[PDB]
Amino acid sequence: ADKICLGHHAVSNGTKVNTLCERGVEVVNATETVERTNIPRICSKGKRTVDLGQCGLLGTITGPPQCDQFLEFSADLIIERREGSDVCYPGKFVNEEALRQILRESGGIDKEAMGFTYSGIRTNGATSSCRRSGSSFYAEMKWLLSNTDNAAFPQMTKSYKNTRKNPALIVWGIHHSGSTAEQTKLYGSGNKLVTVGSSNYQQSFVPSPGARTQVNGQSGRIDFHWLMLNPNDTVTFSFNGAFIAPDRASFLRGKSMGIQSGVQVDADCEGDCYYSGGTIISNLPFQNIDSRAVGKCPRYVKQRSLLLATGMKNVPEI
Amino acid sequence: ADKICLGHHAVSNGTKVNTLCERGVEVVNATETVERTNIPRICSKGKRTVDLGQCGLLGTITGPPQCDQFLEFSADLIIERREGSDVCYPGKFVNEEALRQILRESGGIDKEAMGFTYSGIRTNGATSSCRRSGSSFYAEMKWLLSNTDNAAFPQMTKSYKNTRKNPALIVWGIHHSGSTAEQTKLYGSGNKLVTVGSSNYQQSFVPSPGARTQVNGQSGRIDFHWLMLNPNDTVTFSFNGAFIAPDRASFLRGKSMGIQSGVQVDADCEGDCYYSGGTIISNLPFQNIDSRAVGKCPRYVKQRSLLLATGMKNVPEI
Amino acid sequence: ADKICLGHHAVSNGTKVNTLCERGVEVVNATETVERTNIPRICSKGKRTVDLGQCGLLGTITGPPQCDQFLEFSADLIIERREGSDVCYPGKFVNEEALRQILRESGGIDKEAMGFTYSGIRTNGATSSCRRSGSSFYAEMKWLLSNTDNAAFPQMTKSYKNTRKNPALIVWGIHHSGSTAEQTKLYGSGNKLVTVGSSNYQQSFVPSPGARTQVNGQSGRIDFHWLMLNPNDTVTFSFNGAFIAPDRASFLRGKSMGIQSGVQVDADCEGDCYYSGGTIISNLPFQNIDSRAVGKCPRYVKQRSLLLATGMKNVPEI
Amino acid sequence: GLFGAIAGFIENGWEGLIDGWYGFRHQNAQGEGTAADYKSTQSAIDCITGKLNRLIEKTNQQFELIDNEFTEVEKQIGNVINWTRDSITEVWSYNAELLVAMENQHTIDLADSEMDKLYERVKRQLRENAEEDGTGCFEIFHKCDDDCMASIRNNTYDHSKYREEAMQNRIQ
Amino acid sequence: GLFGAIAGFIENGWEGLIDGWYGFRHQNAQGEGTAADYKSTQSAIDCITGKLNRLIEKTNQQFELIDNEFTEVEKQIGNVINWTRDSITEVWSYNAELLVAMENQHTIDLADSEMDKLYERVKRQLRENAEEDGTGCFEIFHKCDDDCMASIRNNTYDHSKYREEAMQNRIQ
Amino acid sequence: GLFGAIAGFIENGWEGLIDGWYGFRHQNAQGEGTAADYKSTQSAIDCITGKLNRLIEKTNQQFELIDNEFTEVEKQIGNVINWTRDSITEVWSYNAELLVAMENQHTIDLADSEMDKLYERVKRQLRENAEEDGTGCFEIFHKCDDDCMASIRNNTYDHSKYREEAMQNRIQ
Numbered sequence A, B, C: 001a002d003k004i005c006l007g008h009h010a011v012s013n014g015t016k017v018n019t020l021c022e023r024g025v026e027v028v029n030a031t032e033t034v035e036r037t038n039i040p041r042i043c044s045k046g047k048r049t050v051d052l053g054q055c056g057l058l059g060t061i062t063g064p065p066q067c068d069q070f071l072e073f074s075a076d077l078i079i080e081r082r083e084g085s086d087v088c089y090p091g092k093f094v095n096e097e098a099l100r101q102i103l104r105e106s107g108g109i110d111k112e113a114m115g116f117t118y119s120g121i122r123t124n125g126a127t128s129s130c131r132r133s134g135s136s137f138y139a140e141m142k143w144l145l146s147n148t149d150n151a152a153f154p155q156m157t158k159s160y161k162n163t164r165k166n167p168a169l170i171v172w173g174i175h176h177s178g179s180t181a182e183q184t185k186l187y188g189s190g191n192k193l194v195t196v197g198s199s200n201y202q203q204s205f206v207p208s209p210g211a212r213t214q215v216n217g218q219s220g221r222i223d224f225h226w227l228m229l230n231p232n233d234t235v236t237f238s239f240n241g242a243f244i245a246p247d248r249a250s251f252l253r254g255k256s257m258g259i260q261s262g263v264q265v266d267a268d269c270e271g272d273c274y275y276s277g278g279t280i281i282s283n284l285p286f287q288n289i290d291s292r293a294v295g296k297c298p299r300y301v302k303q304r305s306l307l308l309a310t311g312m313k314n315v316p317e318i
Numbered sequence D, E, F: 001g002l003f004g005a006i007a008g009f010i011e012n013g014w015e016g017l018i019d020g021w022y023g024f025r026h027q028n029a030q031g032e033g034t035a036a037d038y039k040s041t042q043s044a045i046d047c048i049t050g051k052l053n054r055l056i057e058k059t060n061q062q063f064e065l066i067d068n069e070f071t072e073v074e075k076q077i078g079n080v081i082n083w084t085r086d087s088i089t090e091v092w093s094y095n096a097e098l099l100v101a102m103e104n105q106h107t108i109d110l111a112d113s114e115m116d117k118l119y120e121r122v123k124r125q126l127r128e129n130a131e132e133d134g135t136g137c138f139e140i141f142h143k144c145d146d147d148c149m150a151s152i153r154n155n156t157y158d159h160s161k162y163r164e165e166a167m168q169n170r171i172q
């Protein structure tokens, strides 16, 4: 005349998940395993950040007038903007991506004098395309002209030996004029040739005058070359003309990480995954925001949602 | 007095499959999940196909006599054959793989005149290695000779400015003569030098005469260079000799895909996975035919067969 | 008044493993699936091994005095040491990594004479930086000087045609002097230029004298270039000065493998997975020793240990 | 499987069953008879077809050429390309093998569970009226004709009708 | 599930149970009553949370930039970079899908097994004193008040006390 | 352990069993005795060995060097090589972890199923002649000597011999 028995709980509305041999099974809970939300700011607290403005990353080695405050910087995070430029006189670098990748993780630079001295020539060439309070040039290079118009140019040689414990970075430049008369007016008449020598490096360069399209009101060009020096070696420059002499050498310090972005900076935050739109802060193992994120980030998938079951099957009454 | 019983079905001979901790288990059904058959034809219906014969892909820019009908083509699928050649005079391109990869997805080209004009010099250089009805040259380039044997060649400059909304493609060439007397005979005595300038480009070239092995009855060579022009910029050429001048500029249109094959074309078909032997049409997730297939193809594996069970374990009657 | 019972075995101390929804479950037995031990020797039995000492891999083509016994070697395994060098006179190869990768699998080389002959000029240039019993040069190259100090140098041309069935390898060199006066003293006055021609290759080279840092007591440099010849073609060299003529051509034979290590060699062993510290001999599917092993090796993982269960759950008596 | 019904206490299958995967076989005074079940067969077929449909799903991604088979490319980049391709192939082969093994393991256990559930339902239906023999067969202690067997086959069997007679037969 | 308890011989769940996953429901002369079970709920929740924690684990590795989005790189190397990235993405997507499907398949079977284990444990306690009706629960053959139900709930039921009365009721 | 036999209603294992994984333990008037079972031990060992052999399998593929550790290579290509290698390592580590966890989960369930199957077979062999106490032990209602126990062990038990005496003892 008595009866006792058992059952399980149920809910009115469940959630649909996917199993091995079915699609759309209803359960009580499920959770999400894919991240789709971000913070539209560069969150950085506890680290030193440097926000380059109009200054390009490669300009800090040469020093155009727009990079006067980043000549010797220290940072743990480096941010580059879209409007940055690293030239005041028309020209470009050679093999620039490798240099950018090297400098992105450097964590800063330190400058040291070289000690070169010159006699019998003029070393104060100035142009109107780089203006500080008049006509000026790059802050860390010298433009060696002739004594007077249509004069000669003696053949010269210079040398520098590394002393410190770490490898050094050396940068020089070559000038291509906009005519065959300018090469004569400035550097004199005749052939011109420069040569750069080291233990693991021996190259020669020769200018090529010609007419080109006008950029910033100029027709000439400047080409920048670079090399790395082991901490016992010596570098020799032999030249007769068309030389942009260096003045200082750079040494790296520490390590850091660099990104490219277009949003502002927040100093009250914490994050480790950055992309060009903000920060990704989550504990889920997958993300569906950007495929080129850098740092400590989750994995990128093409799916938009993937639900993971948490309760039993849902069997509602009647 | 009465009896009821239960059981299942069985078959005389089953199929052997593999499980987690056993190899060779016999079941009633199994199916195959790896594809091994193909159709030995290029099945293509619903798309425009262009089948280049003796013409090479890079020839359509310069126009050798064997590419006279593909100067301005439009297609969705491009097929290249093994016998295609893109030169009538000995020579080769520079950075050819990148240009080929660019052109394979272009979907076609369109030509536009440049408008260069010349005075004094001759512009009708012809050779016997490219014959249409006699002696002729490339259909889209001009060979600038001198007025007469052992004469002067005035230094000249030419310019062209892009106008349309899309980037353009510019191609020019340099001629390396066989001997040294030939250089004097065709372009006069003295040094020769050419220079090419733009906003993001400043190069110089100089011919290098020298004796080589005879190809097609000739000893000289021609080197072709190319560049891409932004949609608002200008290009300048300055030269004194050894120049092959362009006549038309090319613009891309649309998009397409390109393959290399050696079989015929079938117009009554449908496919999306091509390789060098035909087409792959299947719904199976894996394939074991080729590893360099292009399009929408299944995954490639090394195994030859993989069976999936479709029934219970087979227990035949004793 | 009888009773029967059922049970299972147990042990006093078990091993902890990880399951799908638990960490640290105790079972009766377990095994390991990650390898962490090696043999500190290069185990090689059943194959021919060549152990280059001070000789570099690229030296066997040119033959400095330290590579006199490896001019024509045959091997199945090639070992290179850290102290190996391939130059006796200061200089370096151009595009060396590709050549090293080609030579590492050649399995040996064979030399064949070329047959060049010269008249008038001298062919016995010697230097004090490569000494056998006095002053000597590379064993497979010739240094063509002039008849006497500050004399002329006639323009010359030479050619060689392949005859065998397989592609050949050709190597030549260019000399950059330490000053503009040594060039005059050795090769005479005036401009110098060399050109190399083939069917699929045409290039020109010109020396660049200058002052550099002293290496091995010398200031000049030598640059080595190489090319591959299809087995029916011809190669032509035209020169007036600054040429280091080849004397023999090389052909590959068979196939092999190459490694870099720093341990000794054991002739009583059997192995197929090598790295820079010894040999890996195991049947486990994973390894955690080195990520740059070569041969037939297990997969590399970051975890240190992964235990696989081999018994039931452990429930000790209590 | 791990339920011990197929290849367990049931010795062998029947080759005369052609219209289903499971069925009944009865014998009484009138004669013998055979039939088949519908629900369990439908469940097994349904989940098998679900597996098959889930397997043939197609992902849309397009790939293009990166090397040439008519004129070779520079050695240093071709070596890298070949290395990457060889790296990818092993991953895909391992994935295929693991997936096939897992599915093959799951299917047999599913079928065994279905058979066990079908047996247990019929065992529960006949309470305190039939006796088990240990080979998948039942012995009924009362008189059960064709209508009785049919009412057993579909779930409409009432055990109160024959309780007294079956109890008296079993006790003595 | 493949144990045939949830959505098997138990028709539907209860929406009035809010303090557990499984429970009892009794009816006698005094009235009706409901309760809940503590062990099975904890057993399921334990490695539901265990699975969540195992999935949440975070593995450290740092990646950097290899291309530029302001100034483009050379075509021949950018094509290779894009090819490699597209190759990796498919592998990761496939892995995610397979893992989620497997875990979802396992959880339901675990819950069904827990329900079946509880039912069997309760059944084994009332030897020869109760009968099964087939809808999923029992009928008692003697007088059982609230104390007897409480004793049954917490595994403190002695069947020797009511054996004679239950046997006499069942036989006749 | 979703079958509820090991660490379920069986309290603990036996440390005196050294010649097998499962066994019997009997007690009668003459004394106590212990034995072991051969079929289930072999059934478990076989699939354990199969798993080990399937894991040992070795796939033939050869790899070579692409970079130098004595003289460095150009930066732009070395960065790509390092990036690709770091990408592959994570995939392989994840695969290893998942495989080990899955196999460890499967093995315990297999062992539990074997134990449950043996218990169910022994229970089905004795019909209406024994009673279940709920801890893995059976109570016999007649006189059983060593020969009867041995017959029970190796499937040679005929319940018709002692049916009347056992029934009379159970009723009274």
Ligand SMILES: *[C@@H]1O[C@H](CO)[C@@H](O[C@@H]2O[C@H](CO)[C@@H](O[C@@H]3O[C@H](CO)[C@@H](O)[C@H](O)[C@@H]3O)[C@H](O)[C@H]2NC(C)=O)[C@H](O)[C@H]1NC(C)=O
Pocket: D069, D075, D078, D079, D082
């Ligand atoms: C990267 O791998 C590819 C293929 O996986 C390599 O290309 C293959 O190179 C071999 C060696 O020459 C070719 O074999 C030859 O085939 C021709 C027919 O075309 C035959 O006449 C010869 O006797 C020889 O068997 C093979 O065909 C070719 N595979 C192709 C083109 O698909 C490539 O060499 C590898 N990269 C490097 C740098 O080695």
Ligand SMILES: *[C@@H]1O[C@H](CO)[C@@H](O[C@@H]2O[C@H](CO)[C@@H](O[C@@H]3O[C@H](CO)[C@@H](O)[C@H](O)[C@@H]3O)[C@H](O)[C@H]2NC(C)=O)[C@H](O)[C@H]1NC(C)=O
Pocket: E068, E069, E075, E078, E079, E082
């Ligand atoms: C390798 O893949 C990347 C990623 O898709 C390719 O870069 C993408 O190139 C397209 C085509 O120019 C860019 O679209 C354009 O974006 C600009 C700026 O938003 C917009 O103004 C244009 O109207 C157009 O939509 C796309 O942004 C760019 N993705 C980036 C930079 O992240 C790249 O081209 C591929 N490599 C090669 C060799 O094709």
Ligand SMILES: *[C@@H]1O[C@H](CO)[C@@H](O[C@@H]2O[C@H](CO)[C@@H](O[C@@H]3O[C@H](CO)[C@@H](O)[C@H](O)[C@@H]3O)[C@H](O)[C@H]2NC(C)=O)[C@H](O)[C@H]1NC(C)=O
Pocket: F069, F075, F078, F079, F082
């Ligand atoms: C790509 O990754 C490899 C590592 O697999 C990088 O090579 C490693 O570079 C570091 C930094 O120089 C080396 O550490 C140094 O080793 C020397 C050996 O004498 C030691 O004296 C220093 O104190 C320092 O520990 C490391 O050995 C080296 N690993 C090797 C050669 O296996 C490589 O630099 C990476 N590529 C790029 C472009 O960064």
Ligand SMILES: Fc1ccc(-c2nc3ncccn3c2NC2CCCCC2)cc1
Pocket: B303, C285, C286, D093, D094, D097, D098, D101, F054, F055, F057, F058, F059, F099
């Ligand atoms: F054709 C092939 C391709 C890959 C493997 C393989 N590689 C492994 N690496 C590490 C661990 C297990 N591994 C396996 N076993 C396979 C088969 C057995 C179940 C697990 C996956 C075996 C044969």
Ligand SMILES: Fc1ccc(-c2nc3ncccn3c2NC2CCCCC2)cc1
Pocket: A303, B285, B286, D054, D055, D057, D058, D059, D099, E093, E094, E097, E098, E101
């Ligand atoms: F979004 C996606 C991503 C990948 C696939 C996919 N790719 C496969 N390749 C080969 C075999 C099975 N495959 C599947 N099935 C999925 C779903 C079913 C269980 C196995 C994994 C399907 C949808």
Ligand SMILES: Fc1ccc(-c2nc3ncccn3c2NC2CCCCC2)cc1
Pocket: A285, A286, C303, E054, E055, E057, E059, E099, F093, F094, F097, F098, F101
């Ligand atoms: F050592 C490692 C290496 C990789 C992971 C990992 N990463 C994931 N990402 C996304 C999803 C699952 N993931 C897992 N595995 C989890 C789930 C499977 C069982 C083990 C834990 C965890 C630990």
Ligand SMILES: *[C@@H]1O[C@H](CO)[C@@H](O)[C@H](O)[C@H]1NC(C)=O
Pocket: A011, A028, A029
């Ligand atoms: C599911 O779990 C969440 C917390 O994880 C909580 O809202 C509740 O326990 C469940 N929700 C529903 C709607 O059942």
Ligand SMILES: *[C@@H]1O[C@H](CO)[C@@H](O)[C@H](O)[C@H]1NC(C)=O
Pocket: A163, A164, A165, A231, A232
């Ligand atoms: C450089 O080489 C010299 C040569 O012996 C040695 O004395 C010195 O310690 C090395 N290092 C530096 C920093 O000079």
Ligand SMILES: *[C@@H]1O[C@H](CO)[C@@H](O)[C@H](O)[C@H]1NC(C)=O
Pocket: B011, B028, B029, B030, B031, B310
């Ligand atoms: C086995 O499966 C195949 C595949 O669908 C089917 O064509 C065939 O009829 C099946 N045979 C049996 C006996 O079930």
Ligand SMILES: *[C@@H]1O[C@H](CO)[C@@H](O)[C@H](O)[C@H]1NC(C)=O
Pocket: B232
């Ligand atoms: C681009 O071309 C248009 C032609 O209509 C011209 O008006 C415009 O000034 C050009 N852009 C620049 C920056 O000069």
Ligand SMILES: *[C@@H]1O[C@H](CO)[C@@H](O)[C@H](O)[C@H]1NC(C)=O
Pocket: C011, C028, C029, C030, C310
């Ligand atoms: C565990 O297995 C190993 C080899 O598989 C064996 O040597 C060892 O005796 C086993 N452990 C025990 C307690 O028997």
Ligand SMILES: *[C@@H]1O[C@H](CO)[C@@H](O)[C@H](O)[C@H]1NC(C)=O
Pocket: C164, C165, C231, C232
């Ligand atoms: C090379 O070409 C000649 C004809 O010029 C031919 O006789 C010879 O057979 C060719 N050599 C080979 C190896 O085919």
Ligand SMILES: *[C@@H]1O[C@H](CO)[C@@H](O)[C@H](O)[C@H]1NC(C)=O
Pocket: D147, D150, D151, D154, D155, D156
């Ligand atoms: C079950 O089968 C019997 C066969 O005699 C039939 O009379 C009855 O209607 C069936 N039950 C249902 C619900 O159809």
Ligand SMILES: *[C@@H]1O[C@H](CO)[C@@H](O)[C@H](O)[C@H]1NC(C)=O
Pocket: E147, E150, E151, E154, E156
């Ligand atoms: C079990 O319930 C009964 C009924 O109230 C109670 O007397 C007994 O103390 C309980 N036992 C335990 C261990 O809680």
Ligand SMILES: *[C@@H]1O[C@H](CO)[C@@H](O)[C@H](O)[C@H]1NC(C)=O
Pocket: F147, F150, F151, F154, F156
């Ligand atoms: C089973 O055991 C009994 C008792 O020793 C023995 O008489 C009989 O022969 C055995 N049966 C078999 C098949 O071994």
